[PDB]
Amino acid sequence: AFFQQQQLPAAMADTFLEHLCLLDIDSEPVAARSTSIIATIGPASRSVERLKEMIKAGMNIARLNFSHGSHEYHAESIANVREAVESFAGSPLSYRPVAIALDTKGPGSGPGLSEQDVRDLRFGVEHGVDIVFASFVRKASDVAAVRAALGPEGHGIKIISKIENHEGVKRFDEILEVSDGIMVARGDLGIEIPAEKVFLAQKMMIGRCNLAGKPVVCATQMLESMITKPRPTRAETSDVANAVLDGADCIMLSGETAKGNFPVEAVKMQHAIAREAEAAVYHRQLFEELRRAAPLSRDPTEVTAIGAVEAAFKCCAAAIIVLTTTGRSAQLLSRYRPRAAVIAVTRSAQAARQVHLCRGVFPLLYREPPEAIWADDVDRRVQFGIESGKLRGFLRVGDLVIVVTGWRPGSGYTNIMRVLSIS
Amino acid sequence: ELGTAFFQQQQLPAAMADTFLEHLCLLDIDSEPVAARSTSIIATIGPASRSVERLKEMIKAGMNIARLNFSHGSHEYHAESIANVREAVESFAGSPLSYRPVAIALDTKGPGSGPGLSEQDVRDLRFGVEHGVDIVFASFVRKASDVAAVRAALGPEGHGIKIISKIENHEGVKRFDEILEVSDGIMVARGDLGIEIPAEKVFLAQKMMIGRCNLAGKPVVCATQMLESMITKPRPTRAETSDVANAVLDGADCIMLSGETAKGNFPVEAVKMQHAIAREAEAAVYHRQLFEELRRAAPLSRDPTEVTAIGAVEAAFKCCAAAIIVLTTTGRSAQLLSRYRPRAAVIAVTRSAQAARQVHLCRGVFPLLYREPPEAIWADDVDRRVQFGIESGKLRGFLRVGDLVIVVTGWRPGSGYTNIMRVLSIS
Amino acid sequence: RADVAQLTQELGTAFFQQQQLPAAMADTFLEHLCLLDIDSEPVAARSTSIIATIGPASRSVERLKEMIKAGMNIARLNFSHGSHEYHAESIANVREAVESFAGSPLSYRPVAIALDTKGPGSGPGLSEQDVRDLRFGVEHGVDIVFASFVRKASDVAAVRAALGPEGHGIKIISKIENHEGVKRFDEILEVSDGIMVARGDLGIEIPAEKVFLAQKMMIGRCNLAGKPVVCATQMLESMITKPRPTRAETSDVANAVLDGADCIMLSGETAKGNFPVEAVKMQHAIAREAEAAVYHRQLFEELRRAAPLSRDPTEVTAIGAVEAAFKCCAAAIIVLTTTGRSAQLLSRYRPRAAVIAVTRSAQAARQVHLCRGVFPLLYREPPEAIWADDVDRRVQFGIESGKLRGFLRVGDLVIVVTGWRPGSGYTNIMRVLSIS
Amino acid sequence: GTAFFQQQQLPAAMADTFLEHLCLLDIDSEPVAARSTSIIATIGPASRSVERLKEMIKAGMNIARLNFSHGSHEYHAESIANVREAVESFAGSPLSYRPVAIALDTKGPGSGPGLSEQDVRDLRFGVEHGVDIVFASFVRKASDVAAVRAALGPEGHGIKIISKIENHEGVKRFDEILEVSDGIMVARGDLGIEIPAEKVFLAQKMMIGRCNLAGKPVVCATQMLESMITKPRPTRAETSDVANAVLDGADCIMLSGETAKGNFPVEAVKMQHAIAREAEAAVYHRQLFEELRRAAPLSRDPTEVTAIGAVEAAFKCCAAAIIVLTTTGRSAQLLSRYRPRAAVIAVTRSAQAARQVHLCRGVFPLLYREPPEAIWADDVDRRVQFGIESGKLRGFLRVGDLVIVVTGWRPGSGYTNIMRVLSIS
Ligand SMILES: O=S(=O)(c1ccc(O)c(O)c1)N1CCN(S(=O)(=O)c2ccc(N3CCCCC3)c3nonc23)CC1
Ligand SMILES: O=S(=O)(c1ccc(O)c(O)c1)N1CCN(S(=O)(=O)c2ccc(N3CCCCC3)c3nonc23)CC1
Ligand SMILES: O=P(O)(O)OC[C@H]1O[C@](O)(COP(=O)(O)O)[C@@H](O)[C@@H]1O
Ligand SMILES: O=P(O)(O)OC[C@H]1O[C@](O)(COP(=O)(O)O)[C@@H](O)[C@@H]1O
Ligand SMILES: O=P(O)(O)OC[C@H]1O[C@](O)(COP(=O)(O)O)[C@@H](O)[C@@H]1O
Ligand SMILES: O=P(O)(O)OC[C@H]1O[C@](O)(COP(=O)(O)O)[C@@H](O)[C@@H]1O
Ligand SMILES: O=C([O-])C(=O)[O-]
């Protein structure tokens, strides 16, 4: 029964053609949904009660579109999101962190960072946003300007550069090099370049981000018809599935959740499609290619990450449990696209929110009492991941897990991988 | 010899990549497609696309197959649609640069939950034979016996009509292998399939069926809601263009338009959009792995047509042949070349008007109907048809003097004897 | 180039010119051959063990010391010739030469002692002389038995029974010497610890032009099973009388290593020849060159694709450690082992990094010479009060010995493989350590 | 039939990985195909007898090597005459006649910087006596090849120059040497003295790989069956060396003292023949063809384009043979570079080209003696039928087999462009 579920016959195929031939509509997905859902907050999704339904449906990142609404409007949206998120904090083994992303208005006709963007970025730092989706990034200096406007207090905010025009596509490599990740902003991109070429830019950018090990978001009109209709079109479900098969870390909803009549249903639909698409991923070729393309490294976190993903595939590990302060150890595991869920146990609430940008990372916020012996504290965070995993359905007694830790406290010292039997 | 400009176009840097990941990384929005569009466009005929003048615009935009939906309209209504299509097609018989064969496909109403073929389908199928349709899109095919019933309804005079089985429910998906074995091809009928099975599972059924059809070397059509928003809007959504591109990258031989052309406000624009996306997607196909996998998966064969076809596709890739010119009576030799997905266009020269229309079901086949009177000496009749294919190729933009072409012929007249592959320099 | 650019900038272009590294990074086997370079010097320690047959030319304690320094890892006693008294003296001389270096772990070299049986002769089962010789082996503490003319699984069970309860730890390497042994190979390998491709008798039992097929098939199946395989007989035959081998002989040694053999053997070359030490030096020189020429990219990928999924944590840790070692060009994989099994499971994935196996078992230290790339270190310190400190001291012992022996340098990365509790069977930890 | 797929290591050939291919190698799987690696036998006191040479041709000798390091011009002229007499004794039966090449192996430069004066005299002797190939000793650079070419003069333009790589400089300057040479000999005797003995296998494997990539013949030479000079059976290292030279990709294997001065010249040839057939069946064509295909550059030459199409077609149907018409041997050489499992039966009217194509693995030359037919299409058909009739007589073909037929569109060399699939009747 285990080998009939999650497209395992198609996963064992020796060629991609045979993999497609073995895809089965009766093979049910078992693993947790890896691709994060970004939902744009607006009139249709602003209430605390509606936001609780969206968190339960699968929303991982709340997007604030600063093209519309005042600072007072967005502060209320943030407070409502935080209230809905913290309503589930009473059960720590099942609490789901939710990131808050600020999407900038953009430069418009201006040459650099607009004055409104400087004010909105400052607002973001003051309100503790986790991510910035920087509109119309055309070159590396645009990213440096966004970074500078965040100041010394916004050092930890992730900058996701939105590629929306020909210049952004042509200067992609220099933009990705200085950014934390990319958003394929298909709405403007589809007007700036011929509509029939957007798929080439999406597939290229996702590929280059996967190669770089940096998050990539597929955005705009994924389930457009769901703004007025309860069910999407056949092109829309195919688009969501293909963004996941392309290698996107995140999928987004704009009008579908901000102003549409079915915001919760749009989130449920993206969740349902993503789980199906993630099981249909051809890991045999994907891992081989990612593994071959990733350069040789003398960084112990990078070295441990490859060893752990290889070990997870060898035993069909249910999960890779990793201790992370900044999210980096979980991100380095995520770049190899393991089938095993990457359960990231962290004390940082911000890192827990931000790792939703990395596919297959399931953040757990550690709020249990400290142990006096560092080694004892480490084993406690590990047993915590195992209890949250059992509660959420990721793990069962008898499963094997790969545990990734470091040799001393503080970020940057991950160097250990262990094979553990559950219970 | 070819120049650096040649190797910058049609995603050639991405095509030479050693891995699929590197292939994606090398895809370039500035790399323009050069080759002719190889995925056929099926357009549904209705009130928005019925007039002779509108049909001429649709043929110019790229329509290769006209679909008659027998779920609506009388026999008199469909006969008029057929006559209007034929009039619009024959209006280009003058200029060889613009003349193009257009297939006529009859889409059946269906069993509507009843045993065997419905009485209306028996009558509509008989209408199709009497009006000389080329293809039948058989609705709600659930098992092999459904195909045999459609085949028996094509009566004594319609055995040459191609049966494309529409897979629209769970049973059709589960019994796919037995259905494909007795069918000429398949249509992934996503509209009903999306209601019959969970909407989030349709992509698995589409990708599986396209894969199995590619492995079998039989045509597969991707259908329904590809550019749905274009029924009321002049431009499609980002999901819609992505869907068209992904159906081509999946391996579909044909893409379809339904309400977009039958009843919408922009039928010609919907055809133009599918044409534009398909050309872009066909250049982005990763032929290196696709050919290797089709080669490895295809069983060994002692059929000389199958053996010649793989030799010719290999020869075309080796020299970047501008085209593979094949002589075919039934379309079979062109279909066997098409199954290996050559980048080179397959120019199929035939005396059969029906085979010329039907080969639009096979990706990359460009049919040329040959009407010259036969030569007393057979080898001369063959050379005249090879030169007809070269001159139409030169006229249409495929070929130039100095290009290399692969020519596929047989050792004796009649169907079933293809066994020769020649490398020719265009003079 | 982009997959090695930062590491090339860090380690230098000279590092990537040595040990056939340009040929190792090739994307195809054809390109790998095209990039093989006679100027690319081997850097790694020799990983294929040399088995030298002991005889009149290699019996003195002084000669045996020169053979240990030349590279002999396993001493073979051919029980087809000589009395029990003769073999006991050979064993004592080997042990005396081996223990003459036991003053420091960075100079000590464990040497296994293998007993090669006379065989069944015309008989259907175990001979009475073999029963006596096998009991002699147990009484004299031999590490391995090379069982002659193994034709089926019951032959190996008979050898195992004749070793008795005290010889349970002795490794049985079945010699395949005829058509029946080749046809029943799978059942023989299943019950044996390893195989010897006994080419001398095999070349008489089957057509001489078919021996290479049997050698390549058996080596492949042993590599797939993760069990040791020895290539034997006439590898450097002409060196019995000549100081230099023929062009076919050096090619044979290189090709046995490229085929995947864990061990290579010398018979008359060391037992009776005029150049026993030179024959060992020649096999050492060829094996080092051939090991660097191995196409690890395809070999590792194929060992992973062929190896079935495993729920054994030792097996899971071993593949993770080998993957980590390739990622950083680790100088070594240091493993703690009681029976040698954790080191054997690392060895089956054919890492380029040396597997330094730290053990308290003197017998396991001798027996792991059967596994390609395993460098045994015998730990002699008494156990620490805290188990977690005892483990750490053993790892530091492997690092300090590795530094003093040239395997490791300051700045190198090493992969360390340990377990969660004492006793055999609990390896489950892999650590990436920087050498300071 | 099931029996067909049990022979010639077909289970091992269908394997998905090289490791599984090795695991499936079967000593009971008998080779069926004709031996495709040519055997070069060195002529000497043990192999000059016209009667002994007839036995060596029957055993499998394809190329007779004259070592100009020993013997006078008078001695070598007699060698040539004896070889030609033994070869032409079988000309009475054209369907089974085997052409045999004559190769002149030069003495070399010695302490000199360039072409020695003795080599100039020996080279002119070769042109005057109609040798087919020159094995040029101690080639260190491209100018050495140009000097050998110049010493052959205007009448020796058709002679093939195989450069012998015997030292470190030849290995370092390999690419420039191969570019101007027709092929290479891995001259292991001197190479094993010039560089460390333990490095020769790296130079052999590299050179064979580069020659295979270039589509040019490569010869593995020296001490392959050395012990057979005095013993009736070779050592285990010797049979392994022959098998591994074939698995490496060598087009030719050589015998020196084994046939020139030993006591078992015919048995040494029979042993190389037996080992080569076994090793050729054990070749992992799945990866080999894929890699040769991927590495070979795109081509606009119709002979090259036809050759790859014909090799692909031959693999698709398990063709027993690829029958090619060739004037210079080039069309057959271009088929050979893709290492088809199907025998390449080359029909030619050029006696020299028939002898020289023995340098290309898997090329079986047939000398066609009939004067041209008036109708060119009938002349082409008669040659193809001669290849079929020869192939049936020699065991290459049977009724029911499929064969790939490679021809051109007009007479003369350089116009091959047609591939056809033919059923044997
Ligand atoms: O060559 S294909 O286009 C073909 C399509 C139809 C066929 O029937 C077929 O045989 C051949 N094919 C396309 C799908 N992929 S895939 O395995 O799904 C895959 C998909 C995506 C990959 N990354 C790397 C690039 C960034 C995103 C993640 C991958 N990395 O490695 N493999 C990958 C195989 C290759
Ligand atoms: O990767 S390997 O070293 C390995 C893999 C797992 C093993 O278990 C093993 O022992 C070793 N391996 C070594 C043998 N070859 S091979 O298939 O015999 C072969 C042999 C030779 C090839 N050319 C290129 C060089 C000139 C001659 C033709 C070839 N081109 O493509 N394949 C080729 C596969 C690759
Ligand atoms: O992924 P990051 O940010 O580098 O954090 C990983 C760090 O977490 C740990 O596992 C635990 O460290 P702390 O006890 O400081 O939380 C470290 O050993 C390791 O360096
Ligand atoms: O693709 P099909 O239907 O088998 O037709 C291919 C046939 O066409 C030809 O090339 C030409 O035949 P005709 O002269 O009868 O048209 C035949 O030699 C070959 O058998
Ligand atoms: O390779 P083996 O034979 O399983 O031995 C590995 C064992 O060695 C250890 O690393 C150390 O164990 P000891 O304290 O008994 O020496 C164990 O944790 C592990 O189980
Ligand atoms: O391999 P080569 O030397 O190019 O010779 C091939 C030539 O042989 C032929 O097949 C037959 O030519 P001939 O009639 O002159 O022998 C030509 O059509 C072709 O050009
Ligand atoms: O800004 C965006 O999100 C877009 O343009 O798609």
Ligand SMILES: O=C([O-])C(=O)[O-]
């Ligand atoms: O009938 C159709 O075309 C469908 O259901 O999509």
Ligand SMILES: O=C([O-])C(=O)[O-]
């Ligand atoms: O016994 C042996 O070692 C042999 O026969 O090779």
Ligand SMILES: O=C([O-])C(=O)[O-]
């Ligand atoms: O010259 C040769 O043949 C050699 O040196 O091997």
Ligand SMILES: [K+]
């Ligand atoms: K915005």
Ligand SMILES: [K+]
């Ligand atoms: K219908």
Ligand SMILES: [K+]
């Ligand atoms: K013995």
Ligand SMILES: [K+]
């Ligand atoms: K010479």
Ligand SMILES: [Mg+2]
């Ligand atoms: Mg925008």
Ligand SMILES: [Mg+2]
């Ligand atoms: Mg329908």
Ligand SMILES: [Mg+2]
């Ligand atoms: Mg023996």
Ligand SMILES: [Mg+2]
């Ligand atoms: Mg020499």
